[PDB]
Design a protein around this ligand. Structure first.
Ligand SMILES: NC(=O)c1ccc[n+]([C@@H]2O[C@H](COP(=O)([O-])OP(=O)(O)OC[C@H]3O[C@@H](n4cnc5c(N)ncnc54)[C@H](OP(=O)(O)O)[C@@H]3O)[C@@H](O)[C@H]2O)c1
Length: 274
């Protein structure tokens, strides 16, 4: 497992996080593979997927419940657990309730990282960030961050927050390159913010052109195309990735991607795909 520093914390985290969207349901709870999913999560944690990405929204709360069971076989302090508050709950009292229920469902006293899941232009950022600071002061949150903030909003968040904003979790992969067009990745890299790439496999939906260049490079490393697209992200400074893998095979395969060394010319060729 590759490790990288989170923001300017002097703390390193696993550079591959464990995406949990769809585990125990999507927008609503799905109780139908609960034992299988708890066992999957335990096996991922045991393989080294100690950085876990979840949200109150996930499975209508049930994803955090399953994660809550799975983490009982491990020392809590060895795990890096990330949750998120949905844009409907960014008002102070709603945020603190969401935090509390997240903690209840995880059955733990704190989260390692807590994110604004999406910005809500109707709720002043300063209010939301100050409520999150209360969470930190109370020992309920170790670090705060944001998600789906463009460069301007990240700047605005940084100016309005007593606590450091350690990351911006955004969509970023071999095809989806809004963080490059926005100057967001450069901003993060110059200002000690970790960019966390969600949908880092683009849910496997890729054009023919990108598949063609991915295949060449994959075979040169005797890897899969998905391994190449993870290694490409991990090769960039300040970039961490959160693939979702509901199968052992993919958990194992994606872990291997942390020991691929792409050449300079392969990096340039891959950069040229979006
Ligand atoms: N707003 C936000 O902040 C936001 C939005 C979207 C996602 N996220 C987070 O980011 C995570 C990942 O994003 P995502 O789930 O949207 O997309 P993703 O990780 O790009 O792709 C997930 C899909 O790829 C498959 N997969 C994974 N590894 C594979 C491999 N080696 N070979 C073939 N297929 C593979 C999975 O299948 P199997 O499950 O069968 O392995 C799943 O269907 C989510 O779980 C969530 O934690 C956050």
């Amino acid at each position: 497992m590759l490790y990288k520093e989170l923001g300017r914390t002097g703390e390193e985290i696993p550079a591959l996080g464990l995406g949990t969207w769809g585990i125990g349901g999507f927008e609503t709870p799905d109780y139908s593979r609960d034992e299988e999913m708890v066992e999957l999560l335990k096996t991922a944690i045991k393989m080294g997927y100690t950085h876990i990405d979840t949200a109150e929204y996930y499975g209508g709360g049930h994803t955090e419940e399953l994660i809550g069971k799975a983490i009982k076989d491990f020392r809590r302090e060895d795990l890096f657990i990330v949750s998120k508050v949905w844009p409907t709950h960014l008002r102070r009292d709603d945020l603190l309730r969401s935090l509390e229920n997240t903690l209840k469902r995880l059955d733990t006293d704190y989260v390692d990282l807590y994110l604004i899941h999406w910005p809500n232009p109707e709720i002043p950022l300063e209010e939301t960030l100050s409520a999150m600071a209360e969470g930190v002061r109370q020992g309920l949150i170790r670090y705060i961050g944001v998600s789906n903030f463009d460069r301007r909003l990240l700047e605005e968040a940084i100016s309005k927050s007593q606590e450091p904003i350690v990351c911006d979790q955004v969509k970023y992969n071999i095809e989806d390159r809004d963080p490059e067009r926005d100057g967001l990745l450069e901003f993060c890299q110059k200002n000690g913010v970790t960019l966390v790439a969600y949908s880092p496999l683009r849910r496997t939906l890729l054009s023919e052109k990108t598949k063609r260049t991915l295949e060449e490079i994959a075979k040169n490393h005797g890897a899969t195309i998905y391994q190449i697209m993870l290694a490409w992200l991990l090769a960039k400074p300040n970039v961490v990735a959160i693939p979702k893998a509901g199968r052992v095979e993919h958990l194992r395969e994606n872990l291997k991607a942390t020991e691929i060394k792409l050449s300079e010319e392969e990096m340039k060729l891959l950069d040229s795909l979006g």
